[PDB]
Design an enzyme around this catalytic site. Structure first.
Site, short mmCIF file in Angstrom:
data_model
loop_
_atom_site.label_atom_id
_atom_site.label_comp_id
_atom_site.label_asym_id
_atom_site.label_seq_id
_atom_site.Cartn_x
_atom_site.Cartn_y
_atom_site.Cartn_z
N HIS A 45 0.81 -1.21 0.00
CA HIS A 45 0.00 0.00 0.00
C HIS A 45 0.85 1.27 0.00
O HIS A 45 2.08 1.22 0.15
CB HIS A 45 -0.94 0.00 1.21
CG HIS A 45 -0.22 -0.09 2.52
ND1 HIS A 45 0.49 -1.21 2.90
CD2 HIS A 45 -0.07 0.81 3.52
CE1 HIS A 45 1.05 -0.99 4.07
NE2 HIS A 45 0.73 0.22 4.47
N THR A 48 1.91 4.39 -4.59
CA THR A 48 2.98 4.33 -5.59
C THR A 48 4.27 3.58 -5.24
O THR A 48 4.63 3.43 -4.08
CB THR A 48 3.36 5.75 -5.98
OG1 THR A 48 3.73 6.48 -4.80
CG2 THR A 48 2.18 6.45 -6.64
N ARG A 49 4.97 3.15 -6.29
CA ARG A 49 6.20 2.40 -6.14
C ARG A 49 7.14 2.77 -7.29
O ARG A 49 6.71 2.92 -8.44
CB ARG A 49 5.91 0.89 -6.18
CG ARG A 49 5.10 0.35 -5.00
CD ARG A 49 6.04 0.24 -3.80
NE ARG A 49 5.47 -0.37 -2.60
CZ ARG A 49 4.68 0.27 -1.74
NH1 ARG A 49 4.36 1.54 -1.95
NH2 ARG A 49 4.27 -0.35 -0.64
N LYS A 265 5.86 12.59 -2.01
CA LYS A 265 5.92 11.48 -1.07
C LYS A 265 7.39 11.14 -0.82
O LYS A 265 8.18 11.07 -1.76
CB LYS A 265 5.19 10.25 -1.64
CG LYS A 265 5.01 9.14 -0.63
CD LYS A 265 4.23 7.94 -1.19
CE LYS A 265 5.15 6.88 -1.74
NZ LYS A 265 4.42 5.64 -2.11
N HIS A 269 14.83 5.02 3.49
CA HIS A 269 15.11 3.62 3.18
C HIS A 269 16.03 2.82 4.10
O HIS A 269 15.75 1.66 4.41
CB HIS A 269 15.65 3.54 1.76
CG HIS A 269 15.62 2.17 1.16
ND1 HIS A 269 14.48 1.39 1.16
CD2 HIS A 269 16.57 1.45 0.51
CE1 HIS A 269 14.73 0.26 0.52
NE2 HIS A 269 15.99 0.27 0.12
N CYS A 315 4.31 0.94 6.54
CA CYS A 315 4.37 -0.29 5.79
C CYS A 315 5.60 -1.11 6.17
O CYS A 315 6.40 -0.68 7.01
CB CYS A 315 4.27 0.10 4.31
SG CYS A 315 5.07 -0.94 3.08
N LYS A 348 8.80 -3.35 -7.92
CA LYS A 348 9.07 -3.14 -9.35
C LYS A 348 9.27 -4.46 -10.11
O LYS A 348 9.02 -4.53 -11.31
CB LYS A 348 10.31 -2.25 -9.52
CG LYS A 348 11.60 -2.89 -8.99
CD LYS A 348 12.79 -1.96 -9.14
CE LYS A 348 12.71 -0.80 -8.15
NZ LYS A 348 12.92 -1.26 -6.74
C1 LIG Z 1 6.78 -0.91 2.62
C2 LIG Z 1 7.36 -0.25 1.52
C3 LIG Z 1 7.85 -1.09 0.56
C4 LIG Z 1 8.32 -0.58 -0.65
C5 LIG Z 1 8.26 0.84 -0.88
C6 LIG Z 1 7.76 1.73 0.16
C7 LIG Z 1 7.32 1.20 1.36
C8 LIG Z 1 6.79 2.12 2.44
N1 LIG Z 1 8.65 1.44 -2.06
C9 LIG Z 1 9.10 0.55 -3.03
C10 LIG Z 1 9.46 1.14 -4.25
O1 LIG Z 1 9.41 2.35 -4.49
N2 LIG Z 1 9.92 0.23 -5.26
C11 LIG Z 1 10.04 -1.16 -5.13
O2 LIG Z 1 10.44 -1.86 -6.04
N3 LIG Z 1 9.68 -1.67 -3.93
C12 LIG Z 1 9.23 -0.85 -2.94
N4 LIG Z 1 8.83 -1.43 -1.71
C13 LIG Z 1 9.02 -2.93 -1.52
C14 LIG Z 1 7.82 -3.72 -2.09
O3 LIG Z 1 6.57 -3.01 -1.74
C15 LIG Z 1 7.86 -5.09 -1.34
O4 LIG Z 1 9.08 -5.73 -1.63
C16 LIG Z 1 6.66 -5.95 -1.87
O5 LIG Z 1 5.43 -5.39 -1.66
C17 LIG Z 1 6.94 -7.32 -1.36
O6 LIG Z 1 5.81 -8.15 -1.87
P1 LIG Z 1 5.26 -9.48 -1.16
O7 LIG Z 1 4.31 -10.08 -2.06
O8 LIG Z 1 6.37 -10.12 -0.48
O9 LIG Z 1 4.44 -8.83 0.18
P2 LIG Z 1 2.83 -8.39 0.16
O10 LIG Z 1 2.57 -7.59 -1.01
O11 LIG Z 1 2.73 -7.86 1.55
O12 LIG Z 1 2.10 -9.74 0.08
C18 LIG Z 1 2.11 -10.78 1.11
C19 LIG Z 1 0.71 -11.18 1.30
O13 LIG Z 1 0.59 -12.43 1.97
C20 LIG Z 1 -0.43 -12.38 2.94
N5 LIG Z 1 -0.35 -13.26 4.08
C21 LIG Z 1 0.51 -13.14 5.12
N6 LIG Z 1 0.44 -14.12 5.98
C22 LIG Z 1 -0.53 -14.94 5.47
C23 LIG Z 1 -1.09 -16.18 5.91
N7 LIG Z 1 -0.67 -16.78 7.04
N8 LIG Z 1 -2.07 -16.77 5.16
C24 LIG Z 1 -2.49 -16.16 4.02
N9 LIG Z 1 -2.00 -14.96 3.52
C25 LIG Z 1 -1.02 -14.42 4.31
C26 LIG Z 1 -0.71 -10.87 3.25
O14 LIG Z 1 -2.05 -10.54 3.68
C27 LIG Z 1 -0.18 -10.17 2.02
O15 LIG Z 1 -1.28 -9.77 1.22
CL LIG Z 2 4.57 3.85 0.10
#
Ligand SMILES: *Cc1cc2c(cc1C)nc1c(=O)[nH]c(=O)nc-1n2C[C@H](O)[C@H](O)[C@H](O)COP(=O)(O)OP(=O)(O)OC[C@H]1O[C@@H](n2cnc3c(N)ncnc32)[C@H](O)[C@@H]1O
Ligand SMILES: [Cl-]
Ligand SMILES: [Cl-]
Length: 383
Positions: A45, A48-49, A265, A269, A315, A348
């Site tokens: 969330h 943007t990324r 924004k 990091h 986040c 990304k």
């Molecule tokens: C946090 C952050 C990260 C970030 C960023 C700015 C912030 C504040 N800016 C970025 C940027 O400009 N460019 C870029 O390339 N990356 C940037 N990031 C990193 C990126 O957002 C993270 O690396 C990425 O989102 C990682 O993805 P992943 O798929 O690992 O994580 P998720 O999207 O959170 O999805 C995990 C999902 O799994 C679910 N979940 C968790 N536990 C369970 C269980 N037990 N059972 C079922 N589902 C589960 C979660 O609910 C989640 O949806």
């Molecule tokens: Cl963000």
């Protein structure tokens, strides 16, 4: 409960992308998420990324970055949701004192990426709103930019579901039961089995991978971002203010131009609080560092964007020891795929990772070179 060809646990950035790739091919897929993606409890969330091609974390990421970019353009054409805006990405730092800036330049040379090299006042002159010392240098990538992360997940989901993928929301997976010829997951809403499993739980990978008998060091980090009232005549995307990732003496910062007046924004990091995804405080401003670390950067490098704090977000990053991803088959189960520890810079690549996970799940192999993300590499400390 039910059997499927493949089950994706964690339908976020990586999981939803993988689900779309699998559904595209007629593979009967079940995606299970603890919430309803896109949501605000994971790592995707914040609207943007940034997507960069010339990669400062390592030139070896470029191929995946370029494939991911083409996939993001393909997605843009497939959905009504906005996916990408070519803001360009500016990377700057003190001349000869930034390993990050240097590797970006080297990565650009090695892959013949289009970039503009500038220094000191040339930076300040080109982009009103940025004020850096004369000893600073920069590398600008005009063709990379910003992705609308929640839209990306929203789009991949709609497309995958339309193709027959099933998404079981608000269902936390509590345990795994792996067998030589099948996989099984346990949830409060029932058990599900399949031929293959893709595990992509984000920050929760740090807590639940033990359920798969894996002991890998993974540390979740509380990382905040702030949206500040800015001088639109300088920081708006409409006047070409770029996305940015820079290295200054006290760390690395990343930011976005103002879109439709949402304000610039910014995020810090290299610093964050070590946390647990189940007990993390998601309210912005509870640590004095949240807002002060941001304004300290703004007052110094982008003063016209140091206005009222419009919105704050909290986040999570999930870091590995070497800050490189984990994309590989489970060491003892070829029918289990792990996607973890994207260490704060994996969004990304999510489009490309989706493709990789799909290939590993279906064939146990991928056409991509993912050796640097091996789950057995020494720098990881995996057991
Ligand atoms: C946090 C952050 C990260 C970030 C960023 C700015 C912030 C504040 N800016 C970025 C940027 O400009 N460019 C870029 O390339 N990356 C940037 N990031 C990193 C990126 O957002 C993270 O690396 C990425 O989102 C990682 O993805 P992943 O798929 O690992 O994580 P998720 O999207 O959170 O999805 C995990 C999902 O799994 C679910 N979940 C968790 N536990 C369970 C269980 N037990 N059972 C079922 N589902 C589960 C979660 O609910 C989640 O949806
Ligand atoms: Cl963000
Ligand atoms: Cl992450």
């Amino acid at each position: 409960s039910t059997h499927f060809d493949v089950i994706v646990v964690g339908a976020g950035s990586m999981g939803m992308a993988a689900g779309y790739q699998l559904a595209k091919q007629g593979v009967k897929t079940l995606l299970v998420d603890a919430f309803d993606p896109p949501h605000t409890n994971g790592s995707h969330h914040g609207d943007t990324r940034i997507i960069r091609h010339a990669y400062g974390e390592g030139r070896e990421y470029v191929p995946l970055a370029l494939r991911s970019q083409e996939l993001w353009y393909e997605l843009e054409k497939e959905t009504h949701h906005k996916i990408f805006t070519k803001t360009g990405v500016l990377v700057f730092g003190p001349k000869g004192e930034s390993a990050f800036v240097a590797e970006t330049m080297e990565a650009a040379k090695e892959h013949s990426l289009t970039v503009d090299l500038l220094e000191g006042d040339e930076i300040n002159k080109r982009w009103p709103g940025i004020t850096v010392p004369e000893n600073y240098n920069a590398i600008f990538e005009p063709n990379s930019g910003v992705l609308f992360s929640e839209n990306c997940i929203r789009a991949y989901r709609e497309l995958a579901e339309a193709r027959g993928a099933k998404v079981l929301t608000h269902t936390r997976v509590e345990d795994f039961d792996i067998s030589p010829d099948s996989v099984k997951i346990e949830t409060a809403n029932g058990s599900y089995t399949a031929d293959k499993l893709i595990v992509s739980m984000g920050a929760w990978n740090s807590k639940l991978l033990s359920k798969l008998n894996l002991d890998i060091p993974l540390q979740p980090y509380r990382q905040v971002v702030g949206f500040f009232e800015s001088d639109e005549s300088k920081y708006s995307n409409d006047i070409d203010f770029p996305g940015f990732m820079v290295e200054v003496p006290n760390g690395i910062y990343y930011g976005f131009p103002s879109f439709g007046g949402c304000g610039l924004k910014l995020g810090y990091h290299t610093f964050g609080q070590k946390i647990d995804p189940d007990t993390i405080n998601r309210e912005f401003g509870v640590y004095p560092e949240d807002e002060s670390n941001l304004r300290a950067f703004l007052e110094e490098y982008m003063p016209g964007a140091n206005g009222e704090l419009k919105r704050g977000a909290v986040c999570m990053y999930t870091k590995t020891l070497d800050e490189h991803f984990i994309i590989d088959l489970h060491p003892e189960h070829s029918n289990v795929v792990i996607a973890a520890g994207f260490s704060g810079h994996g969004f990304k690549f999510s489009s490309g990772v989706g493709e990789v996970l799909s290939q590993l799940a279906l064939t146990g192999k991928t056409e991509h070179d993912i050796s640097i993300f091996s789950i057995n590499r020494p720098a990881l400390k995996e057991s």
